[PDB]
Design an enzyme around this catalytic site. Structure first.
Site, PDB file in Angstrom:
ATOM      1  CB  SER A  38     -10.041 -19.026  -4.502  1.00 51.90           C
ATOM      2  OG  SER A  38      -9.742 -18.767  -5.874  1.00 51.90           O
ATOM      3  CG  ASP A  47      -8.265   3.467  -4.268  1.00 51.47           C
ATOM      4  OD1 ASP A  47      -8.730   3.835  -5.363  1.00 51.47           O
ATOM      5  OD2 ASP A  47      -8.995   2.838  -3.453  1.00 51.47           O
ATOM      6  CG  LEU A  81     -12.120   3.629   0.836  1.00 48.35           C
ATOM      7  CD1 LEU A  81     -11.750   4.247  -0.496  1.00 48.35           C
ATOM      8  CD2 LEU A  81     -12.996   2.386   0.644  1.00 48.35           C
ATOM      9  CD  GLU A 131      -3.040  -1.094   0.257  1.00 46.15           C
ATOM     10  OE1 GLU A 131      -3.173  -0.065  -0.467  1.00 46.15           O
ATOM     11  OE2 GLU A 131      -3.812  -2.081   0.163  1.00 46.15           O
TER      12      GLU A 131
END
EC number: 3.2.1.17
Length: 164
Positions: free
Chosen positions: A117, A20, A32, A11
């Site tokens: 996943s 972002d 955020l 980040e």
């Protein structure tokens, strides 16, 4: 390496409001502020988050405090989510960091959508999980970061973060 170092690499650290990768107003280590296109709205969220009138700029200590809060929130989001918690609990420590990283980037609900996943991760079918994880908007939009997180799930090592 630990989750803080891993997300600090992914980040960065910026002390002034920035946008972002999706164009949303953000500050610090990937905190955020809002998805609103209004900078004034973002400044208002910032002041509320820090507890003072910041005029769009914070200190490194303030950024690190938000970051602590945000990592804690990602872990809590996992532990409260019936789809995510069992997979997380099944993982080793390094792969748990990869999970926290995904939840930090895309939120609890988004990650909980990665049904196939998650199953492959719970089953420890690492190469299959890695292939499935890459079949995603996530990978296509942020491929260098996704590749690091996926390598971490595939291998259970910090190899993708060691060069940096």
């Amino acid at each position: 390496m630990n989750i803080f170092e891993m997300l600090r690499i992914d980040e960065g650290l910026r002390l002034k409001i920035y946008k972002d990768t999706e164009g949303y107003y953000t500050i610090g280590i990937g905190h955020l502020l809002t998805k609103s296109p209004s900078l004034n709205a973002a400044k208002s969220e910032l002041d509320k988050a820090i507890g003072r009138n910041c005029n769009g700029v914070i200190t490194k200590d303030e950024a690190e405090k938000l970051f602590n809060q945000d990592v804690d929130a990602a872990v809590r989001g996992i532990l409260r989510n019936a789809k995510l918690k069992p997979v997380y609990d099944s993982l080793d420590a390094v792969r748990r960091c990869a999970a926290i990283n995904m939840v930090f980037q895309m939120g609890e609900t988004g990650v909980a959508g990665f049904t196939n996943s998650l199953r492959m991760l719970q089953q420890k079918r690492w190469d299959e999980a890695a292939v499935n994880l890459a079949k995603s908007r996530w990978y296509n939009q942020t491929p260098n970061r996704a590749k690091r997180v996926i390598t971490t799930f595939r291998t259970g090592t910090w190899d993708a973060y060691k060069n940096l």
